[PDB]
Amino acid sequence: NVAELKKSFNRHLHFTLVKDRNVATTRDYYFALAHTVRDHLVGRWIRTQQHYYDKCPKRVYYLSLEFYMGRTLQNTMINLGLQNACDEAIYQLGLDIEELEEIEEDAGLGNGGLGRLAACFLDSMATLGLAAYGYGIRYEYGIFNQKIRDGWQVEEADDWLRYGNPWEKSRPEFMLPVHFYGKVEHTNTGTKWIDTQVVLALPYDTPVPGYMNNTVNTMRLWSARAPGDYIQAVLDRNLAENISRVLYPNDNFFEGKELRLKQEYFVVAATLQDIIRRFKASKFTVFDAFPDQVAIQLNDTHPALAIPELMRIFVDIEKLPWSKAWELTQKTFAYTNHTVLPEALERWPVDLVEKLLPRHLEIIYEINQKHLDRIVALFPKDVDRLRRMSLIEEEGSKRINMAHLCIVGSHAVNGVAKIHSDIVKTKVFKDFSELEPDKFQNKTNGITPRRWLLLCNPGLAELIAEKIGEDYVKDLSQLTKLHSFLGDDVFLRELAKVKQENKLKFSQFLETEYKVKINPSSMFDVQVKRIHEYKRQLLNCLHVITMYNRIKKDPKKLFVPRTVIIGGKAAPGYHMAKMIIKLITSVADVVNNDPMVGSKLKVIFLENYRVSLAEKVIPATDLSEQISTAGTEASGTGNMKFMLNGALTIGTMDGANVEMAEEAGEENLFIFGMRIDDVAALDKKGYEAKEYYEALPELKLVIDQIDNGFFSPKQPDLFKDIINMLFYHDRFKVFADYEAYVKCQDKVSQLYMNPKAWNTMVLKNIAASGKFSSDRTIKEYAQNIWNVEPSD
Amino acid sequence: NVAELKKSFNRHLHFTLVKDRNVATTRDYYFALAHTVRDHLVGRWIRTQQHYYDKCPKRVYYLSLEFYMGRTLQNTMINLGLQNACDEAIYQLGLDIEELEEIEEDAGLGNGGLGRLAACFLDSMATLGLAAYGYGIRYEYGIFNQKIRDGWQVEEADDWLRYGNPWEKSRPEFMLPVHFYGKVEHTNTGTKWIDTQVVLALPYDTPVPGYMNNTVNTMRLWSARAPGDYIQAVLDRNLAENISRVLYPNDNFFEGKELRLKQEYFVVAATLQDIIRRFKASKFGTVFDAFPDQVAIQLNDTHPALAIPELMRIFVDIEKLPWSKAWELTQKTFAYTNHTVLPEALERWPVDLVEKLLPRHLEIIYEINQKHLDRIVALFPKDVDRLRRMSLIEEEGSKRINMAHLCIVGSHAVNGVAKIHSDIVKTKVFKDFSELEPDKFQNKTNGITPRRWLLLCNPGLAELIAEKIGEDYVKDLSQLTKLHSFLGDDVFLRELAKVKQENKLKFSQFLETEYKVKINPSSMFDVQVKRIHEYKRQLLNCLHVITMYNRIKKDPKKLFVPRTVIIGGKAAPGYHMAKMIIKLITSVADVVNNDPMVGSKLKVIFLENYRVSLAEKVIPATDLSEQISTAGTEASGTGNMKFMLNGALTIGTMDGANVEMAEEAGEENLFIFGMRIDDVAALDKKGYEAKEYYEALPELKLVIDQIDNGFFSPKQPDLFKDIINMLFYHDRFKVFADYEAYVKCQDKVSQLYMNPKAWNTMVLKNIAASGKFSSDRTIKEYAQNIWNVEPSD
């Protein structure tokens, strides 16, 4: 009750923060409330873990280098059914819970979709009652804080643990040693990796509360600690601890740095030991049942080294015969592929691996040897097949194809969207899937309806609950029941009203953050995600300029006002992406300050886009931009978040976009541009950018405007690199989709002119978004890959 | 009551540790109990701080680079009066209180006596109800952990915060920026220190509970945090945070490293800002006229010397006060404590280094110096040497700043730590200065807290005394003189000795389990524990051990008082001699300990990893305390006081506080020997010829040749060449010059040890006269004659 929550809060403020109400700070209150909320998890956390030991169900281990978790407080309050009461207690204490909630640092230990999927999964798995564990690195610094200086992205260290994290519990008794470098000996008592360097792995446990269900699972993040001149030797301890120091800020791009390889082995070695530990300590030659008790999901190839590591443990330590160890290994691992771009592919140079992980390279060679021995046996005269299927790339400086390793060391390989999984199976890994068709499957991504609905959009969640009950929260497929209210004008009005309140709250945020007067009744056109060429924020920028020009040539023409928001972080070393940011801020400066356009159109670059900000901007969106070149977005997930929160989608037939269309009906989505096939034919025929440039007046003007310095007077050639790429090196064919895009955009504004018809489509969307719950995704994984059963 | 303490303990284990009794670990329990104990401090902590704001009494600020605090749990339980109840609750919960307590990591943010004095002071000041604050650095790594490998000291990182510290509370809202480097700008708006590098200073507060008195003061320790290639730039953040990373392991030795200078400015800048900020927020542009009446900053040796030019910098560059005023307020604010006379310990920073790190401060230091010498010239026109002798700058060769001179001129009071010491500091070392201002120089004999050094480390003795004279002595140690009434009490003397016996037995067990050696429980425990240093003469002790060993061989049947000689202490990592002397002791130990001839007649142990928590163990179990520093080298000493309070007799020179212990207990009740400060001066004049004693004393010569010929290092006959060479041609501490008197003195000790009744009689005379050495007395004198603050009860 309220009375007791206030007692607890005041107790923590007193004993935990050691503060008086007259000298407490907002951070003091936030921490007090956080502890008060955490205390309500303890019982179920301890109980849940105990229960797994007692009933010994098969455990699922999600191994990933990233966990884009965002904030915890509110998510915990909601999942525990404590939000309303905490809200009231904090209120009665003369405080604003929303003010306390903003003090919390995001746990941005991720780059984007890949890291956010793990976070959503952790939520679903706990909600479905699975004995699941999240394993990753406790980066001292997550994804950098993006600031905008003179229109350019600037990075600042994300010191998220500076003031402490009340949601974690260090478990020193489970500390483990990790080995790096050294050499290998093949003694008569088994082979031995000796003269290695050791780095301790200290685990920190974070509670993962299921939604209203008695389950609180665990997320275990490891921290690196260290085991001439004295002072210097002490300072040098920083080198070992530098391993879990900061997250590599790359999204869909492989950067073969040695430190990154260390991070990868670090988490893979600490996790496997811990897993083997817990197994050999369970109630249960003993390892014969390992695969029936353990399931390790490989989040992309980053934790690929987990395969040769398990084998290493099985053979070098447990002394099992290779045959057995290898059989158990394949049964233990499952690999998820989320890559398409060739630059995202992880190909480690054998020289680097040999120097850091000598024993693992040997194991990888062995796996490869036995692997190709099989192909040769099956396809004798196929010599190319061998080099095409080898885990080693001999071409020039030899490199290890981590994906091939994952495919051979796993009993299941999956894509993240029908379209994606199909290309992965039939195209990218045809040689492999041909041998074992059954191994390759699909698992369309999903998002958690808790954080992405109940939490970020209470108004909508409430509206829906009032009309169909709260069952939808644990079974989102229940949203189809909203189809009964299609002809309900009072409901459509309520729906729109909810969206209006969202836009207003967010508009305030914008006005206070940026010096710009937002038009509360304008259509909110939002494209938020990591800045990437394949994502085409550039394409969007051409439409904004294209829109601006139209306003000048006819400032009196009836126009649907718009507030175009574009946000996203750029990898620090991604030049183009950083150039595209400058362009947007540049175009924004002109548009936003032209007295001619005035309140007809406003452009904002949403700074520091992250999970907590996404929860703010998504619920306030009218139009969601998902315009990646066909075949480039494996699936996407932000797309699903917009659809669930009442936004219409303008996008290509790419990733999950295709499935959202299947569910809601293509006509209820603004699909445009060329499809995967058209992109192939254009590739064959060849891509001549200038053609569209000369063929389309609207475009040409936009381009020349960009090229001539219209958006950068003091630096006319500022966007030279962009213009050059656009014309001679655009793999994502921006101009090839410009016409269809702008045409599509016009149709959007048209429908926006008919409120009743717009909210009708919106409803058709929300009502058909159930499929995209990460609860459905996890059920399919558990059923067809992990072989585990859910409980309640 | 017990019932409630058990409730809280179980609540913390559950909610704070998130653990079940079936999976909890000992550390889990230790942390649970710690939190349970901390909770009982909160009210008084919050209340005490509030009270200072309300009644605004003058605040004392102890600025030091070291705070050797040891463990907190038990000390907190005792001071709060919760030990019994906590003891009770943990017992009923079926847990071993001793096992939980030994879990606690030592807070060794100090090197030895200088850092331990601050820790003791914090305790007294809180016990006396003073509005005092301790300010220092929160080193991630304190004094290294010493291990012994192949008889050699080995250092291991002291990762004391690895599992967390339940006694601290980070206060981020009080975070401050510190500046380094940059350049000085001389404009019309004045002087602007521009283009500096910034390092954040994050404070962590630790409660300092007074003994049974409602007061809980604060110890504020600062942590450094940071404000091309991205990843690399992030990793490079380690450079700023490296400032508060580890404590420099030097004792009585100056190591002019730039990082150390950074640590020194870091703590001095964060502290002054914080002090100035609390002053403005107090109830007193801004008016600082009353600053000195509200603030007192005690400089613990010259390490935080930069605090002077920094206050001036703040006063002038920021607050815009006129130099005249700022300088007047500054002197009234600062007081400086001189802790040593060892030239090699003297802090003399090269002006080039300071100029590059703290450009503005060098200017301020020059200004201070200019105005300073301007005064001397006015008073002593024809005295040109006096000028260079009194200058804050040493122009001799590479110019250096004499931090001590700076402290003397920027303080209204300068003090030594023992009568003998303070006298040399005043009349000799700084005669030129004291001559000008006699009244500025004073003495404040050191003291130790009777809480941690009696009640905590020696419950049996504390209890015995309480049973005979009441517990008033704990807050007024002078009450120990009441124990003189039991001089002719044979039953009491027997009880006293018994207490000591139980101590020796408990510790003997420790030794047997730690080291593979059979200790003789009835042997006299000869202990010399302190930092390894030549001036301290552990080497002298080693010659007596060898001298003793040789006697046992030439007559294994001679009636002999058995002994267990223990020698412990850490050596500064880069201190060669000290590390050689350690090897010698372990070497001599190996021979003696394994000679079937000597057997249980004599055993030698090198107490590994000597630290505060171990000192609490070995001191109460000591019969003979070795305080044999060369006359004039130990400013005061404090371990000496700890032994005296715990029932050990003292064998030592007339040095430091040894002289005062003698005054109190009576010289005849102390085993004083060797030459005194004067004799050392005459020998210096006459010159020191080591070989003389070597050739003049057979016992010695044999010892030496034994050492020199490889008797103690067969596989390496010349191993101790450097030692032998120093002993003969470069021994500034005249080890041979005191060898005869020393060994003679040692014999007298064994003699008295043969008469139990007469030995415990002297011991009683010692314990009964140790009251003066309570840090409660020391702090009272500081408050009274330096800080001008009144105690609150």
Ligand SMILES: *Cc1c(COP(=O)(O)O)cnc(C)c1O
């Ligand atoms: C959901 C989410 C993403 C993934 O978005 P896409 O548009 O699918 O790339 C990226 N960043 C954040 C902060 C997210 O919440």
Ligand SMILES: *Cc1c(COP(=O)(O)O)cnc(C)c1O
């Ligand atoms: C008291 C104490 C000292 C001081 O010893 P002296 O022999 O007086 O130099 C040094 N270290 C520790 C651990 C102490 O407790």
Ligand SMILES: CC(=O)N[C@@H]1O[C@H](CO)[C@@H](O)[C@H](O)[C@H]1O
């Ligand atoms: C390498 C990588 O980060 N892939 C990303 O993964 C997420 C989650 O699978 C997909 O939705 C998205 O399309 C894709 O860009």
Ligand SMILES: CC(=O)N[C@@H]1O[C@H](CO)[C@@H](O)[C@H](O)[C@H]1O
């Ligand atoms: C510089 C330094 O560490 N000096 C030491 O200070 C302590 C505390 O005052 C004295 O007891 C001791 O004699 C002296 O050696």
